[PDB]
Design a protein around this ligand. Structure first.
Ligand SMILES: CCC(O)(CC)COc1ccc([Si](C)(C)c2ccc(OC[C@@H](O)CCC(=O)O)c(C)c2)cc1C
Lengths: 11, 240
């Protein structure tokens, strides 16, 4: 329920 | 009667697409190779292809005017729910109606219904997928209409989990007004309305294609031997 990879690509 | 803001939006989306879609398909050489010879022999190659495309869709979405004005949670919700649909949309550029295949450069990277079958999927999805690609291709969209359709599909307030739905709608409304106005400058009525209506119908078709892919993905990914062949990004985006 946490998305560290999507967040990194969204940053 | 395209306003300069509408011309600006189209210029932004055209450039965003050119920076996230490589017509040479050179990066396909870095994927696990396709096996066609039963085992899901094309699952490793197609999982890498899907993973690569998820990255491109995220890069495209980041450049949509107004997208970064949303909270990070809404950006995540919009991308998780639309990634599959944008992949099907952007895949139409390589789709050819000669043999109902996605031609990406060579015979190694030319995919047909049997190749999708080799990734675990059935005709419950592939038959609707093929008629979508054909109907989309028959529209003969300009690149302007293509990139606008992808952006509108991403910024949709009709997604579960959206917090600021009114803001998402306002962003989509200017993309929608931009697409409607672009069509009117290139097509007199009633053909203008017949084109926009068919494009909205394609977005509706993608919702049912989304639902059927997730059902089959859930059944496929439930088996650890299948999820072992996926990528971390695919597991994160398609799973949670
Ligand atoms: C892994 C998850 C599964 O469900 C298995 C568990 C399989 O999923 C699959 C399998 C096959 C397809 Si497809 C519609 C035949 C396809 C065709 C071409 C294509 O190339 C895009 C290219 O246009 C990007 C080029 C660029 O951006 O530079 C892409 C990405 C997809 C779609 C899905 C979703």
């Amino acid at each position: 329920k946490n998305h560290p990879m999507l967040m990194n690509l969204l940053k | 009667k395209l306003s300069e803001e509408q011309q600006h939006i189209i210029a932004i989306l055209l450039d965003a697409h050119h920076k996230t879609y490589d017509p040479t398909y050179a990066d396909f050489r870095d994927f696990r190779p396709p096996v066609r010879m039963s085992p899901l022999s094309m699952l490793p190659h197609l999982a890498d292809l899907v993973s690569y495309s998820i990255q491109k869709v995220i890069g495209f979405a980041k450049m949509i005017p107004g997208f970064r004005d949303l909270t990070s949670d809404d950006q995540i919700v919009l991308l998780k729910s639309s990634a599959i649909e944008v992949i099907m949309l952007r895949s139409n550029q390589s789709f050819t109606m000669d043999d109902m295949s996605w031609d990406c450069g060579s015979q190694d990277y030319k995919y047909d219904v049997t190749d999708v079958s080799k990734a675990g999927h059935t005709l419950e999805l592939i038959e609707p997928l093929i008629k979508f690609q054909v109907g989309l291709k028959k529209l003969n969209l300009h690149e302007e209409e293509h990139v606008l359709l992808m952006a509108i599909c991403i910024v949709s307030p009709d997604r579960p989990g959206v917090q600021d739905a009114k803001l998402v709608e306002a962003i989509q409304d200017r993309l929608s007004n931009t697409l409607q106005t672009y069509i009117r400058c290139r097509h007199p009525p009633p053909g203008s309305h017949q084109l926009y209506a068919k494009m909205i119908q394609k977005l509706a078709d993608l919702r049912s294609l989304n639902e059927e892919h997730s059902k089959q993905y859930r059944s496929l990914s439930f088996q650890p031997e299948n999820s072992m062949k996926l990528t971390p990004l695919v597991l994160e985006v398609f799973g949670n």
